Amino acid sequence: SRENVPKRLPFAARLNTPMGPGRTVVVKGEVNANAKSFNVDLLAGKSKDIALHLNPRLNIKAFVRNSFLQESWGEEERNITSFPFSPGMYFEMIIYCDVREFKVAVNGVHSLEYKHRFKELSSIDTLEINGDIHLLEVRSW
């Protein structure tokens, strides 16, 4: 399609346009009633570096973020001011790429910022989604 090409869960897709300031990726889904965890990753398809790993942990109500670069995970980022997911419930997560950071919102509420660690934004071209959700729609504009 116009925005990505899968390459339903686990889900992997090549973004038609790579990331950069102004780019938005939207994941719409329903958390499983018995969910423990799910993951949304933005990857550099070539190097397989993970620029942004997003992991809502339903079992402990934590929202963990990290990057996998030079074949190692970095320092986990965990601070939240609320946990925006709940089992059984529909959600919309917006990943917005800004100049210095990603901005992530859930259900229309700003949730976190993640300072870019992988700096070559135009090399981020792959989206992977897996875990304890029913994936309903992915948008990328």
Say which CATH number the domain at 81 has: 2.60.120.200
To the question of whether residue 92 is assigned a binding role by annotation, the answer is no
Q: How far apart are CA 24 and CA 103, in angstroms?
A: 9
Does 78 belong to an annotated binding site? yes
In units of Å, what resolution does this entry have? 1.6
Experimental method for this entry? Answer: X-ray
Q: Is the dihedral of CA 101, 106, 109, 111 positive or negative?
A: negative
114 CB contacts (<8 Å, ≥6 apart)?
Answer: 52, 65, 77, 101, 102, 104
30 is in an annotated binding site: no
Number of domains in the chain: 1
73 is in an annotated binding site: yes
31: Cβ contacts below 8 Å, ≥ 6 apart: 38, 58, 85, 86, 87, 88, 89, 91, 132, 133
Among candidate residues 22, 24, 56, 61, the one with its CA nearest the CA of residue 42: 24
Q: Answer yes or no: are the C-beta atoms of 120 and 43 closer than 8 Å.
A: no
113 annotated to a ligand binding site: no
Instruction: Identify whether the C-beta of residue 114 lies closer than 8 Å to the C-beta of residue 121.
Output: no
Residue 19 belongs to domain spanning: 4-140
Q: Is 77 annotated as a binding residue?
A: yes
Q: 15 forms bridges with which residues in the sheet?
A: 4
Using DSSP's 3-state secondary structure scheme, residue 87 falls into coil
